[PDB]
DNA sequence: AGAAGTGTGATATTATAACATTTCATGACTATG
DNA sequence: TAGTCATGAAATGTTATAATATCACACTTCTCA
């Protein structure tokens, strides 16, 4: 049974204490707001949610928080949109993942892919290309959306 | 002259399909071809203003849309940027993009295995995938030698 | 001592009087506005701004125009989609008549407090709550008339 | 009342020897059915239901004709077009009162303003060809909504 | 001191919405005549 | 035997803003000598 949202937050607090990094109230609040989402969320949508608690929040507030949360591996940037999602796999050591993005209902599943990382290394190796990071993002329809089509 | 050939080839493909490769569109294509690899729209607009001083953002974006709709360029989603497709006349294809974070060069490769892993991974879930975005950041060969010294 | 210096100093003073930031970028756009004979489109103004600020893009000139509009420093000429420096920043808000030549493109700002009153009376008859008047005349200026006579 | 103006328009396009085509008529019809100002591209959307192959030049050529006759006025400060109050009168200068909340536009006469403008021009060397007179604010209805 | 964090206004970058005209081909009623 | 007038259809020009992201400064704060 996968790690719960709440367990991911506890784990984030303790990981930051283990590293000597400061999971501040803002960064924490930003983190939980993202955990509440059923998928990715844009920075300015996130800013709007943040305002309900902290009305004085501006874009720098959100972006600083996201940068920190990104550097610590709690959040991933979904590049093909311009959105951000909670990482559901930081309890393990740092990882490769592939994002599966629904175009209509907007939800995303993060799924590990060992074979993908390796194939990309293999393609990178043949050319003289020192691969550093992979971006794997899939677009289509998720299960629930498929059964709305069947109507 | 590799550019000349490349342009002559695009004029031919656009003649085949009932489609207008206008001077403006041709010019943008020429500029990107001469570019090593990736280039932002606004850097491309700056170059375009050499030949067309009145060019504005819609000008460059309209040309990109055209060149995107035909097979000639790809968006590089992880750097808001654009590059020539390495082989034109083929239909809508999923390619793996290896982008150099130092010099902007981009090698477009086939990645059948990746598509097949995502194909099966989507199938074990209820996911019906239309398109994959596969982009790798790192360093190209030349820049690898340079970073080692 | 020069009109432009004097004019910018006035603006610097008013913006201090009001607790409001006349930034270098806003200063530069205003400087450019003041060197124009008459009216200039936002994009012609951007090209000029690019000479001093090569990175300037459309939002850059639109923000600066919005600021200069909020304050009393420039007017929008609605019928030609362009912008002119206000002749006198000294006044508060004001209704101003704009005489626009459709040959040489020049624009001349005039007062007409009579017009304010007529419009306020007309709006008052109906229940209308007036905020701004747009009053623009199109024709040929004196100069263009001389030329056209030959 | 929509059909009354359409017939009246053809009458006037007989007198002045100019061809009110079905294209122009259709736009005039659509302008009439609208009870207020409308943008060219919103007008294009409506023209497309009748004539799906219509494009921006289609609507602008039409508008240019309807403008050059008496039939429609441009609202310069909103980039939109409004049917004339009544076009049996001699080519007149409208003064458009424009509600910034509901977008209602009320055409009024303001000879006082035109008179003043002509006098100002006269003192300069200005050959005055046309006046644009437009007010922005809240219509009566909107004032009462805001009063609550 | 000194490194990290926040508040605030303005600015920078990427992309598209909204408005209007140019272009060129092509089929339509007319000017003498 | 052309002459203006009208339309059709693609692309372009023009004006303005949406959507996304960072910088610069001032004040702070918790930390390190
Ligand atoms: Zn993850
Ligand atoms: Zn879905
Ligand atoms: Zn390709
Ligand atoms: Zn490289
Ligand atoms: Zn003024
Ligand atoms: Zn003149
Ligand atoms: Zn009227
Ligand atoms: Zn109203």
XYZ file of C-alpha atoms (C1' of nucleotides) and ligand atoms in Angstrom:
672
model
C 0.000 0.000 0.000
C 1.568 3.285 -1.214
C 2.599 6.141 1.097
C -0.317 8.382 2.096
C -0.309 12.134 1.470
C -0.053 12.796 5.248
C 2.876 10.383 5.574
C 4.682 12.231 2.755
C 4.381 15.488 4.773
C 5.773 13.993 7.986
C 8.581 12.468 5.909
C 9.316 15.902 4.364
C 9.591 17.552 7.780
C 12.019 14.932 9.054
C 14.114 14.799 5.875
C 14.607 18.581 6.060
C 15.672 18.249 9.703
C 18.106 15.458 8.699
C 19.521 17.685 6.012
C 20.049 21.051 7.652
C 17.426 22.848 5.665
C 14.531 24.955 6.843
C 11.035 23.724 6.057
C 9.434 27.062 6.974
C 5.723 27.709 7.576
C 5.395 29.124 4.043
C 7.230 26.244 2.395
C 5.200 23.842 4.524
C 1.910 25.539 3.676
C 2.811 25.486 -0.002
C 3.681 21.810 0.297
C 0.352 20.828 1.866
C -1.685 22.866 -0.628
C -0.037 20.872 -3.409
C -0.688 17.585 -1.609
C -4.402 18.467 -1.595
C -4.421 18.660 -5.417
C -5.563 15.608 -7.386
C -2.835 16.335 -9.950
C -0.606 19.166 -11.179
C -1.171 22.842 -10.456
C 0.130 26.105 -11.932
C 2.131 28.576 -9.863
C -0.539 31.306 -10.038
C -3.354 28.885 -9.174
C -1.160 27.890 -6.234
C -0.626 31.559 -5.367
C -4.422 32.020 -5.286
C -4.836 29.131 -2.811
C -1.995 30.552 -0.724
C -3.773 33.953 -0.596
C -6.782 32.531 1.280
C -4.472 32.014 4.285
C -1.713 34.557 3.537
C -3.436 37.438 1.639
C -0.116 39.320 1.352
C 1.457 36.530 -0.774
C 2.943 37.551 -4.144
C 4.480 35.473 -6.970
C 7.977 35.513 -5.433
C 6.531 33.807 -2.367
C 5.225 30.895 -4.393
C 8.274 30.649 -6.645
C 10.782 30.722 -3.768
C 8.798 27.975 -2.083
C 8.642 25.913 -5.282
C 12.389 26.297 -5.888
C 13.163 25.000 -2.408
C 10.612 22.192 -2.712
C 12.129 21.340 -6.104
C 15.725 21.361 -4.895
C 14.736 19.107 -2.034
C 12.996 16.473 -4.122
C 9.407 16.957 -2.922
C 7.963 18.516 -6.081
C 8.358 17.944 -9.817
C 7.886 20.533 -12.522
C 5.643 19.230 -15.290
C 7.434 20.861 -18.238
C 4.924 20.250 -21.061
C 2.298 22.114 -19.117
C 3.893 24.741 -16.911
C 2.713 23.201 -13.700
C 3.938 21.590 -10.510
C 3.021 18.358 -8.765
C 3.840 16.657 -5.475
C 6.306 13.792 -5.791
C 4.813 10.543 -4.460
C 8.181 8.726 -4.388
C 10.686 10.729 -2.303
C 10.487 8.262 0.622
C 12.895 6.107 -1.432
C 16.278 7.373 -2.715
C 16.098 9.867 -5.638
C 14.575 8.444 -8.787
C 13.571 8.528 -12.432
C 9.855 8.930 -13.149
C 7.391 9.302 -15.994
C 4.360 11.562 -15.712
C 1.041 10.509 -17.213
C -1.037 13.606 -17.851
C -4.774 13.709 -18.624
C -5.553 16.588 -20.988
C -9.205 16.912 -19.932
C -9.465 16.137 -16.184
C -5.843 17.250 -15.548
C -4.697 14.499 -13.143
C -1.208 12.967 -13.290
C 0.276 9.666 -12.138
C 3.989 9.498 -11.355
C 5.338 6.034 -12.225
C 8.917 4.767 -11.952
C 10.557 3.466 -15.130
C 13.853 1.574 -14.844
C 13.761 0.428 -18.464
C 13.290 4.007 -19.671
C 16.294 5.421 -17.791
C 18.462 2.585 -19.158
C 17.343 2.921 -22.785
C 17.985 6.665 -22.645
C 21.454 5.963 -21.248
C 21.999 3.475 -24.088
C 20.931 6.003 -26.732
C 23.003 8.662 -24.957
C 26.053 6.383 -24.785
C 26.197 5.692 -28.564
C 26.411 9.426 -29.267
C 28.973 11.118 -26.989
C 26.190 12.491 -24.797
C 26.630 12.748 -21.032
C 22.992 12.396 -19.963
C 22.104 14.170 -16.710
C 18.331 14.301 -16.384
C 15.339 12.861 -18.258
C 11.955 14.447 -18.831
C 9.315 11.847 -19.652
C 5.778 13.141 -19.915
C 2.844 11.326 -21.483
C -0.357 12.945 -22.722
C -3.711 11.254 -23.307
C -6.748 10.226 -21.251
C -6.797 8.556 -17.823
C -9.068 5.628 -16.835
C -11.990 7.712 -15.521
C -11.965 9.922 -18.654
C -11.995 6.824 -20.890
C -15.260 5.610 -19.262
C -16.821 9.052 -19.825
C -16.070 8.528 -23.544
C -17.936 5.186 -23.413
C -21.411 6.761 -23.126
C 24.551 25.069 -48.848
C 23.242 22.404 -46.448
C 20.699 25.156 -45.687
C 19.986 25.771 -49.416
C 19.339 22.050 -49.898
C 17.214 21.953 -46.770
C 15.130 24.932 -47.959
C 14.831 23.526 -51.495
C 13.552 20.335 -49.912
C 10.931 22.175 -47.830
C 9.727 24.097 -50.900
C 9.285 20.729 -52.612
C 7.332 19.123 -49.744
C 5.128 22.223 -49.458
C 4.531 22.130 -53.232
C 3.448 18.476 -52.909
C 0.885 19.216 -50.166
C -1.379 22.115 -51.206
C 0.472 24.477 -48.875
C 2.082 27.924 -48.949
C 5.706 28.315 -47.847
C 5.655 32.119 -47.854
C 8.807 34.296 -47.819
C 8.222 34.990 -44.143
C 7.854 31.278 -43.315
C 10.827 30.453 -45.508
C 12.885 33.120 -43.773
C 12.119 31.753 -40.317
C 13.022 28.273 -41.550
C 16.297 29.557 -42.923
C 17.150 31.254 -39.623
C 16.472 28.120 -37.544
C 18.399 25.921 -39.958
C 21.495 28.118 -39.581
C 21.037 27.983 -35.794
C 22.928 25.032 -34.262
C 19.876 23.823 -32.406
C 17.376 25.276 -29.986
C 16.256 28.896 -29.954
C 13.551 30.777 -28.069
C 10.803 32.481 -30.081
C 11.942 36.004 -29.054
C 15.604 35.342 -29.979
C 14.252 34.108 -33.296
C 12.116 37.251 -33.565
C 15.308 39.317 -33.051
C 16.976 37.574 -35.988
C 13.824 37.911 -38.100
C 13.864 41.670 -37.600
C 17.118 41.766 -39.599
C 15.230 40.930 -42.792
C 11.759 42.122 -41.654
C 12.124 45.112 -39.312
C 8.367 45.292 -38.650
C 8.190 41.709 -37.331
C 6.370 41.314 -34.012
C 5.639 38.424 -31.715
C 2.588 37.187 -33.650
C 4.799 37.142 -36.737
C 7.247 34.653 -35.260
C 4.517 32.608 -33.545
C 2.411 32.322 -36.724
C 5.475 31.063 -38.661
C 6.325 28.579 -35.892
C 2.753 27.212 -35.866
C 2.950 26.698 -39.594
C 6.368 25.057 -39.346
C 5.103 22.967 -36.421
C 1.909 21.879 -38.237
C 4.009 20.753 -41.168
C 6.755 18.460 -39.907
C 9.596 20.994 -39.993
C 10.185 21.984 -36.351
C 9.616 20.684 -32.848
C 8.881 22.497 -29.641
C 11.380 21.667 -26.923
C 9.006 21.612 -23.959
C 11.590 21.784 -21.117
C 13.227 24.946 -22.431
C 10.617 27.106 -24.031
C 12.300 26.728 -27.330
C 12.293 25.442 -30.880
C 14.535 23.411 -33.152
C 14.534 21.991 -36.673
C 13.391 18.421 -37.143
C 16.318 16.313 -38.409
C 14.266 14.477 -41.117
C 11.355 16.307 -42.779
C 8.757 14.489 -44.939
C 7.854 11.767 -42.348
C 4.450 11.958 -40.550
C 3.672 12.811 -36.895
C 6.421 10.966 -35.002
C 7.532 10.517 -31.395
C 11.270 11.238 -31.111
C 13.654 11.364 -28.146
C 15.382 14.769 -27.824
C 18.869 15.054 -26.326
C 19.465 18.695 -25.456
C 22.799 20.169 -24.483
C 22.401 22.608 -21.583
C 25.666 24.325 -22.494
C 25.470 25.045 -26.284
C 21.791 24.458 -27.188
C 22.447 21.610 -29.668
C 19.787 18.936 -30.030
C 20.108 15.384 -31.379
C 16.791 13.852 -32.430
C 16.795 10.037 -32.028
C 14.296 7.221 -32.387
C 13.294 5.560 -29.113
C 11.027 2.620 -29.965
C 11.792 0.897 -26.636
C 10.704 3.933 -24.627
C 7.407 4.211 -26.514
C 6.865 0.474 -25.931
C 7.511 0.777 -22.186
C 5.090 3.716 -21.967
C 2.633 1.806 -24.201
C 2.548 -1.131 -21.775
C 2.712 1.101 -18.679
C -0.318 3.032 -19.941
C -2.082 -0.287 -20.627
C -1.566 -1.718 -17.102
C -3.191 1.481 -15.881
C -6.369 2.646 -17.617
C -4.343 5.227 -19.540
C -4.840 5.826 -23.257
C -1.799 7.853 -24.336
C -1.794 10.040 -27.461
C 1.738 11.492 -27.357
C 5.002 11.068 -25.431
C 7.414 13.889 -24.611
C 10.919 12.504 -24.225
C 13.609 15.101 -23.550
C 17.060 14.547 -22.063
C 19.241 17.250 -20.547
C 23.001 16.902 -20.274
C 25.977 17.625 -22.519
C 26.758 16.805 -26.123
C 30.056 15.164 -27.100
C 31.887 18.398 -27.994
C 30.838 20.108 -24.746
C 31.836 16.992 -22.776
C 35.431 17.374 -24.020
C 35.320 21.093 -23.114
C 34.056 20.541 -19.544
C 36.804 17.966 -18.900
C 39.545 20.286 -20.300
C 16.811 74.645 -18.524
C 15.856 72.700 -21.678
C 12.147 71.902 -22.123
C 12.807 68.182 -21.669
C 14.895 68.594 -18.506
C 12.381 71.059 -17.078
C 9.528 68.754 -17.988
C 11.156 65.686 -16.447
C 11.982 67.625 -13.277
C 8.321 68.670 -12.986
C 7.333 65.025 -13.333
C 9.965 63.946 -10.789
C 8.512 66.538 -8.385
C 4.860 65.548 -8.836
C 5.663 61.861 -8.436
C 7.480 62.683 -5.188
C 4.569 64.853 -3.997
C 2.397 61.779 -4.606
C 4.071 58.769 -2.960
C 4.802 57.128 -6.315
C 7.845 55.694 -8.096
C 9.088 57.354 -11.276
C 11.544 54.587 -12.153
C 14.365 54.870 -14.709
C 12.308 52.846 -17.178
C 9.268 55.070 -16.710
C 11.503 58.124 -16.860
C 12.934 56.929 -20.160
C 9.515 56.352 -21.784
C 8.383 59.802 -20.650
C 11.590 61.376 -22.010
C 10.843 59.720 -25.349
C 7.192 60.900 -25.252
C 8.326 64.501 -24.733
C 10.688 64.491 -27.752
C 7.843 63.571 -30.140
C 6.242 66.263 -32.283
C 2.846 64.790 -31.497
C 1.394 61.312 -31.167
C 3.129 57.935 -31.316
C 1.859 54.381 -31.367
C 2.841 52.074 -28.525
C 4.937 49.915 -30.900
C 6.767 52.850 -32.511
C 7.469 53.927 -28.938
C 8.765 50.424 -28.116
C 11.254 50.583 -31.010
C 12.555 53.849 -29.582
C 12.682 52.348 -26.068
C 14.722 49.416 -27.437
C 17.591 51.790 -28.325
C 18.185 52.392 -24.620
C 16.718 49.076 -23.385
C 17.377 46.365 -26.041
C 15.402 43.800 -23.998
C 12.195 45.861 -23.991
C 9.109 43.958 -25.100
C 5.408 44.851 -25.489
C 4.453 44.482 -21.848
C 7.328 46.863 -21.046
C 5.890 49.755 -23.017
C 2.310 48.982 -21.973
C 3.161 49.059 -18.246
C 4.991 52.348 -18.611
C 2.113 53.841 -20.599
C -0.365 52.648 -17.966
C 1.631 54.367 -15.250
C 2.029 57.560 -17.246
C -1.734 57.405 -17.946
C -2.690 56.793 -14.274
C -0.683 59.914 -13.451
C -1.603 62.881 -15.642
C 1.414 62.706 -17.962
C 0.070 61.224 -21.223
C -3.300 60.997 -23.001
C -4.583 58.215 -25.197
C -5.839 59.317 -28.598
C -8.614 56.762 -28.983
C -9.485 57.324 -32.628
C -5.919 56.645 -33.815
C -4.809 54.230 -31.035
C -1.843 56.346 -30.030
C -0.472 58.398 -27.151
C 0.587 61.977 -26.600
C 2.297 63.887 -23.867
C -0.088 66.110 -21.914
C 0.620 69.816 -22.573
C 0.243 70.837 -18.872
C 0.769 68.370 -15.995
C -0.041 71.259 -13.620
C -3.808 70.768 -13.861
C -5.544 67.866 -12.083
C -7.724 65.604 -14.262
C -9.056 67.502 -17.291
C -11.245 67.136 -20.355
C -9.103 68.084 -23.356
C -9.981 68.524 -27.030
C -7.641 66.863 -29.490
C -7.121 68.186 -32.962
C -5.642 65.484 -35.134
C -4.250 66.110 -38.618
C -4.834 63.155 -40.984
C -1.902 64.146 -43.223
C 1.109 65.028 -41.097
C -0.267 63.074 -38.114
C 0.212 65.936 -35.627
C -2.059 66.462 -32.649
C -2.824 69.618 -30.685
C -4.346 69.543 -27.188
C -6.818 72.290 -26.322
C -9.038 73.078 -23.374
C -12.801 73.500 -23.582
C -14.398 73.739 -20.134
C -17.541 74.682 -22.042
C -17.502 71.143 -23.429
C -17.123 69.555 -19.975
C -20.209 71.506 -18.879
C -22.293 70.644 -21.949
C -21.521 66.925 -21.509
C -22.197 67.045 -17.746
C -25.601 68.643 -18.383
C -26.480 66.085 -21.062
C -25.432 63.160 -18.856
C -27.373 64.702 -15.957
C -30.611 64.812 -17.999
C -30.452 61.054 -18.486
C -29.236 59.315 -15.293
C -25.683 58.965 -16.566
C -22.712 59.161 -14.181
C -19.925 60.708 -16.264
C -16.291 59.761 -15.644
C -14.316 60.663 -18.788
C -14.904 62.454 -22.063
C -13.288 61.499 -25.358
C -13.272 64.502 -27.675
C -11.223 64.331 -30.828
C -11.366 66.335 -34.046
C -10.095 65.098 -37.395
C -8.999 67.338 -40.246
C -5.971 69.106 -41.692
C -3.770 71.346 -39.558
C -2.729 74.882 -40.625
C 0.560 73.652 -42.118
C -1.145 70.941 -44.202
C -3.644 73.543 -45.485
C -0.887 75.830 -46.865
C 0.725 72.876 -48.631
C -2.601 71.582 -49.983
C -3.387 75.048 -51.435
C -0.361 74.642 -53.764
C -39.389 46.903 -35.957
C -36.283 45.206 -37.459
C -37.873 44.799 -40.910
C -38.917 48.486 -40.963
C -35.331 49.766 -41.108
C -34.211 47.177 -43.677
C -36.862 48.378 -46.130
C -36.104 51.999 -45.202
C -32.417 51.340 -45.959
C -33.079 49.959 -49.459
C -35.208 53.054 -50.113
C -32.228 55.288 -49.279
C -29.813 53.102 -51.288
C -32.075 53.636 -54.298
C -31.990 57.455 -53.932
C -28.203 57.398 -53.547
C -27.153 55.163 -56.436
C -25.288 52.523 -54.370
C -25.757 48.758 -54.229
C -26.966 47.401 -50.881
C -26.032 43.737 -51.448
C -27.395 40.762 -49.450
C -23.985 40.694 -47.732
C -24.305 44.306 -46.544
C -28.025 43.867 -45.814
C -27.319 40.786 -43.691
C -24.781 42.700 -41.612
C -27.262 45.567 -41.259
C -29.896 43.039 -40.168
C -27.543 41.559 -37.559
C -26.582 45.035 -36.320
C -30.298 45.777 -35.908
C -31.109 42.567 -33.988
C -28.333 43.524 -31.545
C -29.652 46.039 -28.974
C -26.281 47.742 -28.459
C -22.694 48.091 -29.637
C -20.850 45.133 -31.144
C -17.275 44.250 -32.114
C -16.411 43.406 -35.708
C -15.339 39.858 -34.783
C -18.489 39.220 -32.681
C -20.359 40.457 -35.736
C -18.285 38.014 -37.823
C -19.371 35.073 -35.612
C -23.032 36.011 -36.208
C -22.537 36.450 -39.955
C -20.952 32.965 -40.088
C -24.167 31.225 -39.018
C -25.832 32.620 -42.157
C -22.655 32.496 -44.309
C -20.037 30.072 -42.839
C -17.289 31.103 -45.299
C -17.316 34.747 -44.135
C -13.980 36.191 -42.988
C -12.690 39.417 -41.477
C -12.499 41.281 -44.785
C -16.145 40.337 -45.429
C -17.357 42.103 -42.293
C -15.026 45.111 -42.594
C -15.944 45.859 -46.214
C -19.593 45.704 -45.141
C -18.985 47.970 -42.145
C -17.034 50.427 -44.316
C -20.069 50.730 -46.613
C -22.574 51.040 -43.747
C -20.293 53.650 -42.149
C -19.872 55.710 -45.318
C -23.635 55.841 -45.733
C -25.480 56.942 -42.576
C -26.294 53.579 -41.118
C -23.686 52.756 -38.460
C -21.346 54.718 -36.201
C -17.950 53.558 -34.972
C -17.376 53.820 -31.251
C -13.680 54.706 -31.351
C -12.948 54.276 -27.633
C -14.219 50.646 -27.517
C -13.457 49.556 -31.095
C -17.043 48.642 -31.779
C -19.947 49.543 -34.017
C -23.437 50.761 -33.289
C -26.493 51.236 -35.454
C -27.532 54.848 -35.896
C -30.404 56.244 -33.781
C -32.281 57.225 -36.944
C -30.797 57.888 -40.395
C -33.460 60.052 -42.083
C -31.600 63.064 -40.622
C -28.711 64.747 -42.458
C -25.228 63.360 -41.734
C -24.964 64.269 -38.051
C -22.315 64.022 -35.366
C -23.329 61.553 -32.676
C -22.205 61.929 -29.085
C -22.016 58.387 -27.644
C -22.603 57.806 -23.943
C -21.042 54.494 -23.023
C -21.642 52.445 -19.887
C -18.430 50.843 -18.634
C -20.386 48.213 -16.662
C -23.140 46.904 -18.963
C -21.803 48.187 -22.308
C -25.032 50.002 -23.217
C -24.480 52.929 -25.606
C -26.814 55.931 -25.853
C -26.586 58.163 -28.962
C -27.290 61.811 -28.183
C -26.970 65.087 -30.059
C -24.477 67.686 -28.815
C -24.383 70.678 -31.177
C -23.035 72.758 -28.292
C -19.854 70.679 -28.366
C -19.544 70.680 -32.163
C -20.100 74.470 -32.223
C -17.281 74.936 -29.686
C -15.006 72.577 -31.628
C -15.523 74.448 -34.908
C -14.687 77.723 -33.126
C -11.488 76.265 -31.630
C -10.470 74.920 -35.040
C -11.306 78.259 -36.669
C -8.827 80.127 -34.433
C -6.125 77.640 -35.412
C -5.837 77.082 -39.152
C -7.619 73.807 -38.734
C -9.914 72.450 -41.442
C -12.249 70.344 -39.240
C -13.599 67.321 -41.136
C -15.165 65.177 -38.376
C -15.630 65.195 -34.621
C -15.473 62.197 -32.306
C -17.431 62.773 -29.067
C -17.739 59.923 -26.551
C -18.455 59.731 -22.826
C -17.630 56.862 -20.474
C -19.386 56.232 -17.187
C -22.391 54.424 -15.709
C -25.852 54.400 -17.253
C -28.859 55.180 -15.019
C -29.685 51.501 -14.517
C -26.108 50.741 -13.371
C -26.111 53.633 -10.888
C -29.125 52.075 -9.107
C -27.535 48.627 -9.095
C -24.451 50.191 -7.454
C -26.548 52.208 -4.973
C -27.426 48.951 -3.138
C 29.693 40.019 10.312
C 27.172 36.603 7.661
C 24.170 33.437 5.332
C 19.378 32.479 4.664
C 14.401 34.258 4.458
C 10.594 37.484 3.513
C 7.761 41.675 1.804
C 6.994 44.551 -1.903
C 7.139 46.834 -6.235
C 8.659 46.521 -10.497
C 10.443 44.119 -14.278
C 11.484 40.148 -17.473
C 9.923 36.192 -20.568
C 6.687 33.382 -23.187
C 2.437 33.235 -25.722
C -2.033 34.594 -27.459
C -6.223 37.521 -27.630
C -8.318 41.196 -30.243
C -8.549 44.235 -34.059
C -7.784 45.601 -39.051
C -5.684 45.539 -43.708
C -3.079 43.705 -47.685
C -2.995 40.591 -51.538
C -4.192 38.502 -55.393
C -7.267 35.875 -58.052
C -11.881 36.002 -60.063
C -16.289 36.602 -61.221
C -19.877 40.808 -61.717
C -22.498 44.948 -63.564
C -21.279 49.006 -66.666
C -18.436 53.385 -69.469
C -18.303 54.856 -73.622
C -19.283 54.447 -78.275
C -12.562 45.976 -74.185
C -11.576 47.853 -70.650
C -13.388 49.991 -66.049
C -14.870 50.152 -61.440
C -16.948 47.304 -58.276
C -17.724 43.235 -55.457
C -16.367 38.603 -53.315
C -13.353 34.802 -51.684
C -9.650 33.089 -49.267
C -4.866 33.112 -47.221
C -1.715 35.616 -44.990
C -0.117 39.537 -42.786
C -0.194 43.783 -40.088
C -1.399 46.037 -35.935
C -2.653 46.818 -30.979
C -3.066 44.994 -26.429
C -2.956 41.568 -22.650
C -2.652 36.872 -20.624
C 0.197 33.573 -18.462
C 4.557 32.469 -16.444
C 8.849 33.749 -13.961
C 12.734 36.666 -11.810
C 15.121 40.746 -10.075
C 16.281 44.436 -6.835
C 15.926 46.475 -2.615
C 14.884 46.815 2.390
C 14.132 44.736 6.367
C 14.659 40.696 9.170
C 16.313 36.783 11.554
C 18.561 33.148 13.106
C 23.674 31.784 13.106
C 28.733 32.249 13.455
C 32.450 34.039 15.156
Zn 9.019 11.844 -7.907
Zn -8.756 11.950 -16.744
Zn 11.414 15.146 -35.979
Zn 26.922 21.044 -26.448
Zn -3.681 67.205 -20.991
Zn -0.845 68.726 -40.704
Zn -26.566 58.512 -35.621
Zn -25.072 50.138 -17.583
